[PDB]
Scaffold this motif. Structure first.
Motif, PDB file in Angstrom:
ATOM      1  N   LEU A   1     -10.260  11.624   4.947  1.00 52.14           N
ATOM      2  CA  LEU A   1      -9.688  11.215   4.026  1.00 52.14           C
ATOM      3  C   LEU A   1      -8.640  11.896   3.387  1.00 52.14           C
ATOM      4  O   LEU A   1      -7.300  11.192   3.150  1.00 52.14           O
ATOM      5  CB  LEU A   1     -10.450  10.717   3.449  1.00 52.14           C
TER       6      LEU A   1
ATOM      7  N   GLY B   1      -4.461  11.823   2.850  1.00 48.10           N
ATOM      8  CA  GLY B   1      -3.773  11.694   2.120  1.00 48.10           C
ATOM      9  C   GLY B   1      -2.663  12.745   1.991  1.00 48.10           C
ATOM     10  O   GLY B   1      -1.272  12.601   1.487  1.00 48.10           O
TER      11      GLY B   1
ATOM     12  N   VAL C   1       1.837   5.270  -2.666  1.00 50.57           N
ATOM     13  CA  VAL C   1       2.341   6.490  -2.184  1.00 50.57           C
ATOM     14  C   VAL C   1       3.574   7.266  -3.142  1.00 50.57           C
ATOM     15  O   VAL C   1       3.597   7.997  -3.575  1.00 50.57           O
ATOM     16  CB  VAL C   1       1.756   6.821  -1.141  1.00 50.57           C
ATOM     17  N   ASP C   2       3.942   6.043  -3.053  1.00 46.89           N
ATOM     18  CA  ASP C   2       5.705   6.385  -3.582  1.00 46.89           C
ATOM     19  C   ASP C   2       5.800   6.912  -4.495  1.00 46.89           C
ATOM     20  O   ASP C   2       6.116   7.182  -5.502  1.00 46.89           O
ATOM     21  CB  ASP C   2       6.269   5.307  -2.760  1.00 46.89           C
TER      22      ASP C   2
ATOM     23  N   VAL D   1      -7.196   7.282   1.571  1.00 52.16           N
ATOM     24  CA  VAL D   1      -5.485   7.866   2.090  1.00 52.16           C
ATOM     25  C   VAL D   1      -4.543   7.389   0.608  1.00 52.16           C
ATOM     26  O   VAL D   1      -4.312   8.972   0.617  1.00 52.16           O
ATOM     27  CB  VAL D   1      -5.732   7.000   3.136  1.00 52.16           C
ATOM     28  N   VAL D   2      -4.669   6.378   0.066  1.00 53.51           N
ATOM     29  CA  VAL D   2      -3.203   6.204  -0.759  1.00 53.51           C
ATOM     30  C   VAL D   2      -3.774   6.696  -2.235  1.00 53.51           C
ATOM     31  O   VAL D   2      -2.744   6.329  -2.651  1.00 53.51           O
ATOM     32  CB  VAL D   2      -3.847   4.283  -0.520  1.00 53.51           C
TER      33      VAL D   2
ATOM     34  N   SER E   1       5.722  10.023   3.195  1.00 52.19           N
ATOM     35  CA  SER E   1       6.948   9.490   2.176  1.00 52.19           C
ATOM     36  C   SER E   1       7.400  10.693   1.428  1.00 52.19           C
ATOM     37  O   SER E   1       8.818   9.738   1.729  1.00 52.19           O
ATOM     38  CB  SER E   1       5.606   9.427   0.966  1.00 52.19           C
ATOM     39  N   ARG E   2       7.434  11.919   1.351  1.00 51.44           N
ATOM     40  CA  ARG E   2       8.659  12.969   1.419  1.00 51.44           C
ATOM     41  C   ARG E   2       9.663  12.635   2.237  1.00 51.44           C
ATOM     42  O   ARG E   2      10.752  13.217   1.378  1.00 51.44           O
ATOM     43  CB  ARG E   2       8.083  14.736   0.729  1.00 51.44           C
TER      44      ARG E   2
ATOM     45  N   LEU F   1       4.395   4.513   5.867  1.00 52.39           N
ATOM     46  CA  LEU F   1       5.628   5.562   4.777  1.00 52.39           C
ATOM     47  C   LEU F   1       6.828   6.222   5.800  1.00 52.39           C
ATOM     48  O   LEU F   1       7.891   6.752   5.484  1.00 52.39           O
ATOM     49  CB  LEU F   1       4.407   6.850   5.140  1.00 52.39           C
TER      50      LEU F   1
ATOM     51  N   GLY G   1       0.660  -1.245   0.332  1.00 50.04           N
ATOM     52  CA  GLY G   1      -0.180  -0.126  -0.080  1.00 50.04           C
ATOM     53  C   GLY G   1       0.859   0.824  -0.431  1.00 50.04           C
ATOM     54  O   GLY G   1       0.662   2.427  -0.950  1.00 50.04           O
ATOM     55  N   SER G   2       1.890   1.307   0.823  1.00 49.07           N
ATOM     56  CA  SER G   2       3.139   2.305   0.606  1.00 49.07           C
ATOM     57  C   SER G   2       3.643   2.311  -0.426  1.00 49.07           C
ATOM     58  O   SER G   2       3.779   3.926  -0.418  1.00 49.07           O
ATOM     59  CB  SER G   2       3.757   1.988   1.833  1.00 49.07           C
ATOM     60  N   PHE G   3       3.842   1.478  -0.536  1.00 51.91           N
ATOM     61  CA  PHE G   3       4.933   1.981  -2.534  1.00 51.91           C
ATOM     62  C   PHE G   3       4.051   2.584  -3.885  1.00 51.91           C
ATOM     63  O   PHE G   3       3.769   3.270  -4.813  1.00 51.91           O
ATOM     64  CB  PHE G   3       4.381  -0.239  -3.584  1.00 51.91           C
TER      65      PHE G   3
ATOM     66  N   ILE H   1      -1.272  13.999  -2.426  1.00 55.04           N
ATOM     67  CA  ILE H   1      -0.477  13.606  -2.010  1.00 55.04           C
ATOM     68  C   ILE H   1       0.536  13.976  -3.390  1.00 55.04           C
ATOM     69  O   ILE H   1       1.848  13.925  -3.243  1.00 55.04           O
ATOM     70  CB  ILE H   1      -0.788  11.903  -2.499  1.00 55.04           C
TER      71      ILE H   1
ATOM     72  N   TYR I   1      -0.262   3.361   7.981  1.00 52.61           N
ATOM     73  CA  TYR I   1       0.223   4.111   7.406  1.00 52.61           C
ATOM     74  C   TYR I   1       1.864   4.981   7.426  1.00 52.61           C
ATOM     75  O   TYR I   1       2.605   4.720   7.160  1.00 52.61           O
ATOM     76  CB  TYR I   1      -0.938   4.321   5.833  1.00 52.61           C
TER      77      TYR I   1
ATOM     78  N   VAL J   1       3.503  10.102  -5.771  1.00 45.13           N
ATOM     79  CA  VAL J   1       3.908  11.266  -5.049  1.00 45.13           C
ATOM     80  C   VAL J   1       5.626  11.025  -6.468  1.00 45.13           C
ATOM     81  O   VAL J   1       5.962  12.180  -6.618  1.00 45.13           O
ATOM     82  CB  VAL J   1       4.994  11.136  -3.814  1.00 45.13           C
TER      83      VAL J   1
END
Ligand SMILES: O=C(c1c2ccccc2cc2ccccc12)N1CCC(N2CCC[C@@H](C(=O)N3CCOCC3)C2)CC1
Ligand SMILES: O=C(c1c2ccccc2cc2ccccc12)N1CCC(N2CCC[C@@H](C(=O)N3CCOCC3)C2)CC1
Lengths: 696, 696
Positions: free
Chosen positions: B226, B230, A496-497, A522-523, B237-238, B263, A492-494, A528, B259, A500
């Motif tokens: 939500l 995000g 987001v990355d 969220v994702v 992530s950043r 992250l 799931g985190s991938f 984001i 998450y 970005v």
């Protein structure tokens, strides 16, 4: 010569290496440009059947190194390659690039030392990769190899001697290996003195030269091949982020060959050609027992296509070449060139016919590309015949492909609503193993589908440099024990990355009958990456932290429900318990309806979490112009970036918009794109004038 | 007031929220700075027991937003927070930063609306993350939450009406929800007109206002929470790529909370505090049956520490804070500052005592940090007491941690030689599931260990910005069906990508008794990143494409072996078959020895694939100065990069080396580091003079 009396010359006799490649179930290297010509010609036939093509539409020039190791174009006879790696520079006129597009094809020659990788093949492969990268042009790799080359110092084989513990009894053991004076002299005579590292000792009058290390005169025996493999692995890792990289597994890819397949990411595997690390025969020798019967059990399509290592499968080499050529049709001619527009009979100006219903099962592909019906074709969101699905064998809960929107190429991610099954095979290496069948419900992200989504996003972004649309329809991530243990959070985190890092326009659209809830929203939320992302929800879409059942369970509990009965029911306002039992099922339905009334696109608009609420039938017309307006503004943002060095995206965009005539509605996508396309040269002059720049 | 008659004031009474946090099994937010003070003071005691510390060594200042939403330092009473997110700017004098180092601590207040994330908590968390990032200082997050906030329009609850199909029979169903004129007026009166979206209709004389959407006056009910989630997911992530990010799971982390944990990557989980997406209670309601009995089955340490989502576990909050503080001791004070040198009693100038033997089993940790023996402590490669192992619960075949080499902090990756087991739990959700025990041999990369290696490399690189040493000892990747199907190629490829991105010195060292073969060498070869990587092999190490058994099987076959018998055996040179049977076991041993003689570090040096062959006992002295010389040259390379804009690494390094006195041996690490450290200010003047730069 066999066969005699053929109408034309026997090509497998003129070049016996063509016969060797064929005998190994693959196309001879030199015949691959012809497959690209055939595939390219088919592209034209499928596009406009009436097009008259001439041989000048396709040019293939072999690339070889000159005296100073610099790549140069040559016209020579096939089979003249002094190394086991060959390359070609291809210049083709395609429907999307009628004046021409270029790419490089690198390939192993399976007929040259079993297609093994030696230092020379490694340096050439790297040189070709750098050549492609410098020019920004795609790099196609045709894998047909035995991995890193292996050898021994063959000169030391007839010379070495063994220091027996007891000469009369060899079985009793040995002390060391050695060379004699005559053995040493043989090496001296052939200028191979440095083939061994020796240490002289005298044993019973005779001088022995104890072999301490064997080096060998021939290059490409061991570690030097491993170093070269490392060089090409790193080169490919870099190429993937820089240019369009694709690989066709054409015979078998071993060791470094397998890694190259993965490092270039995009892979097409021909049925029956394995991607292996260690072969089945070698593994059985390591394990003792005869465990595997084929290399296909280790690296066939049944493994790699099911894994997502192989994006697509191909019935034969030409089908693979056809798929490379089709995939490339969505990709710019070179790095940083605009995405290739290709308008077909299916214009932007039409409604979307296929519409999902809550009471009926549908294939998401129908929403994407349309569907055949007895009463005629129902058009979908994208151009008819434009959907090119990839990673189709793996994590089938997400549907990923390339498509066209009124000619605009983009990456599409859709959600499979139907329950998906996958079979985990039983490994023959473990006798206490059985095959497992895993079911996964639709509209839920699992570790595999989360990984596939992230993978897709990254593959659209790097090299392909495409915009993207996600038809977001997930109820959340799987939060159960199995999926939590299988690291769903990581996958799931991938996602987001991957978002970005996205450098092209993104459209997130919750479709009709669709939902986006809790962890799934969220994702994928546009905050984001605000520079690229935008979100839309259909008038018939839903979104909230929980599903209505969840919201009721936490926020519309029994005390709140009984108070509502007290207010709304004439009888309620032990004689209470009997009415409670009667009322409860319908009052549970009321609270569920009350909760659902918050989950609407109208609340999403009101709270400013979506750019607009849309009607599905009108989405094609809306998105065509929104995307087209976006590509134009993004083009102008990039030009401005060169002309300053330091300004924020918000500053750049506000400045570009200050250039629009005062009469132009900034909210009108069609008017904005029409004005930019009518003034590219005028805006260019404006930009060239801004070159009154001297800033410290 | 309870309890009465205590010696000092009852802190849980002065602030009842402290008691609430405690009742939920966690530290009250405002008490966390005190835990950082206690942990920081312990760091000093463990470093130099005689150090006299005063309260001025540690400063904690709460950060709150001013009128314009800008963060400012405040001194206020605990529990005054108007939002459920709190932050502190910490300034501590530590053994590695005696003059002070800074960091930010963000934390959920579990006592404020169950620690839920609303839009205000999300905007503050993001503001604090940007604050940390702008300054380059670490961001510590203390997770104690219920995920995204949820609500309903509570004002519409007492006002709504139901359009019954039959008023006398509620059970028969309802048409829609509506408001009356008096219901509408109630909203008008309280300035909540926009709480609903209505559509007026007249039914049997009475005007009904059909509720089409419920929006609500209160913010933080659904989608807006939500969106905010995000925003913070993208922010984290950043942050991971920019600054040192770490998270301590202090009570439970739900949804966005889970998450955020991932992250930020680096996570310490307190025993009994779950990292969940959906709770066990909600899952049982979704599944029907009472499947789970605890949230620990979904997100406890048994899941997350075994997964590698949790890098470490902690017995309580203070142990977690102590581990954050210990981890940070290896990390620069802020982005792009040099790695913090910390010399202890264990100086660089000593041999390495612990030496592995081929005939004996060893723990790789003994080679790393040394080991206690009845005859005294045997020192290892790194400083005594410096090894801080992370990801210790997952993929135990690789050993990852931070350590110090004569004070120099670095990331260490070692290979576990002992066979490792792991238990895959049976999911209660599937009745046809059983727990599986997986064995994995040492010195082989499996999907999990390949993932752990890549993960470690990336975590040393981003935020930590540390140099690294890999004590490379792998026979290859697992090429069997199970591991090929479980995508070993994907995980192996992440290693290459992680090395390509590395921005600090890397040392690859094949240790004594160690080997690096086939696919394992490829993935770690210094040509992957020549700017940072360097390789060394011990005099007692081995390397080759295959193992000697493999090389013999392919290159020293029966015909070659019989010819050797013909040459070396007096009797050989049916009467042959009997001698063949006798000779074969020893001639198989001869060919194995012949093959092994190529696999030596002497061939690696000869073929130029290693920088040097080393003696283990002397490695500490060698690596200390090589690393120290490297850090110095890298410092000068960065300064030069500012002073030009365009020059290659080879050009920059050659120029820096042209500055060394003619007498300086460029190959002498100690002499090179000694000269640079004696002339930093002189070299600075040289660089400031190069500021005669005007290049187009
Ligand atoms: O809204 C609820 C919810 C209920 C949903 C449906 C029926 C009963 C519910 C009861 C709930 C009670 C309390 C909170 C949330 C509830 N959610 C809880 C389940 C959430 N999931 C999202 C999609 C993946 C689902 C999941 O984790 N699964 C389902 C499939 O795979 C196994 C585990 C759960 C969605 C949010
Ligand atoms: O050198 C050989 C090799 C032999 C090695 C040991 C005993 C017999 C061998 C026979 C061989 C015959 C032909 C080629 C290579 C051989 N290799 C083949 C095995 C290679 N592996 C590297 C480490 C992982 C190993 C592997 O894939 N496994 C072993 C553990 O997990 C299951 C599957 C195999 C190493 C290279």
């Amino acid at each position: 010569l066999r066969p005699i009396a053929t109408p034309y010359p026997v090509k497998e006799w003129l070049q016996p290496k063509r016969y060797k490649a064929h005998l190994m179930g693959t196309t001879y290297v030199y015949d691959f440009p012809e497959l690209f010509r055939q595939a390219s010609s088919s592209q034209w036939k499928n596009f406009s059947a009436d097009v008259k093509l001439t041989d000048d539409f396709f040019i293939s020039n072999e690339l070889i190194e000159d005296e100073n190791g610099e790549l140069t174009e040559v016209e020579r006879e096939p089979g003249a390659n002094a190394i086991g790696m060959v390359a070609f520079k291809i210049t083709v006129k395609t429907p999307e690039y009628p004046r021409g597009r270029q790419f490089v094809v690198v390939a192993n020659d399976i007929t040259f030392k079993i297609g093994s990788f030696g230092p020379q093949e490694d340096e050439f492969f790297n040189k070709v990769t750098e050549y492609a990268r410098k020019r920004g042009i795609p790099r196609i790799y045709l894998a047909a190899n035995s991995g890193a080359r292996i050898g021994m110092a063959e000169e030391i084989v007839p010379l070495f001697q063994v220091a027996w513990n007891d000469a009369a009894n060899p079985d009793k053991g040995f002390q060391y290996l050695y060379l004699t004076s005559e053995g040493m002299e043989t090496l001296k005579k052939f200028d191979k003195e440095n083939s061994v590292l020796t240490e002289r000792t005298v044993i019973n009058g005779e001088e022995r030269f104890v072999i301490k290390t064997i080096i060998g005169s021939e290059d490409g025996l061991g570690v030097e091949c491993l170093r070269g493999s490392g060089l090409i692995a790193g080169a490919t890792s870099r190429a993937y982020h820089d240019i369009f990289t694709i690989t066709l597994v054409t015979c078998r890819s071993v060791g470094i060959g397998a890694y190259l397949v993965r490092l270039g990411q995009r892979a097409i595997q021909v049925e029956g050609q394995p991607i292996i690390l260690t072969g089945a025969s070698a593994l059985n020798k390591v394990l003792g027992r005869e465990v595997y019967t084929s290399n296909l059990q280790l690296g066939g399509t049944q493994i790699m296509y099911n894994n997502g290592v192989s994006h697509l499968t191909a019935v034969d080499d030409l089908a693979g070449v056809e798929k490379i050529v089709e995939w490339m049709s969505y990709v710019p001619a070179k790095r940083n060139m605009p995405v290739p527009i290709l308008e077909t009979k299916d214009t932007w100006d039409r409604p979307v016919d296929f519409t999902p219903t809550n009471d009926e099962t549908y294939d998401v592909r129908w929403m994407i590309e349309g569907r055949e019906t007895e009463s005629g074709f129902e058009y979908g969101l994208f151009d008819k015949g434009s959907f090119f699905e990839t990673l189709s064998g793996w994590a089938k809960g997400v549907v990923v492909g390339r498509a066209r929107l009124g000619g605009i190429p983009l990456g599409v991610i859709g959600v499979e609503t139907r329950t998906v099954e996958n079979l985990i095979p039983a490994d023959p290496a473990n006798p206490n193993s059985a095959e497992t069948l895993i079911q996964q419900a639709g509209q839920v992200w699992f570790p595999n589908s989360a990984f596939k989504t992230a993978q897709a996003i990254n593959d659209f972004n790097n090299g392909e440099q495409l915009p993207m649309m996600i038809l977001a329809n997930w109820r959340g991530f799987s939060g159960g024990q199995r999926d939590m243990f299988n690291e769903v959070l990581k996958y799931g985190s991938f996602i987001v990355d991957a978002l970005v890092d996205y450098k092209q326009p993104i459209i997130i659209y919750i479709p009709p009958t669709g939902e986006l809830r809790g962890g799934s929203w969220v994702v994928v939320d546009p905050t984001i990456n605000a520079d690229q992302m935008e979100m839309y929800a259909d008038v018939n879409a839903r979104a909230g932290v929980l599903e209505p059942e969840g919201t009721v369970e936490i926020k519309f509990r029994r005390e709140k429900l009984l108070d509502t009965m007290n207010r709304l029911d004439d009888k309620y306002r032990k004689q209470l318990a009997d009415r409670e039992r009667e009322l409860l099922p319908i009052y549970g339905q009321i609270s569920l309806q009350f909760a659902d009334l918050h989950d609407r696109s109208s609340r999403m608009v009101a709270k400013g979490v979506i750019s607009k609420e849309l009607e599905w039938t009108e989405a094609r017309r809306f998105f065509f112009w929104r995307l087209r307006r976006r590509l134009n503004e993004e083009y102008l943002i990039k030009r401005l970036s060169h002309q300053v060095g330091e300004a924020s995206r918000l500053e750049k965009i506000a400045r570009i918009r200050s250039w629009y005539p005062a009469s132009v509605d900034h909210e009108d996508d069609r008017q904005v794109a029409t004005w930019i396309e009518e003034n590219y040269k005028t805006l260019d002059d404006k930009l060239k004038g801004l070159k009154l720049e001297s800033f410290a």
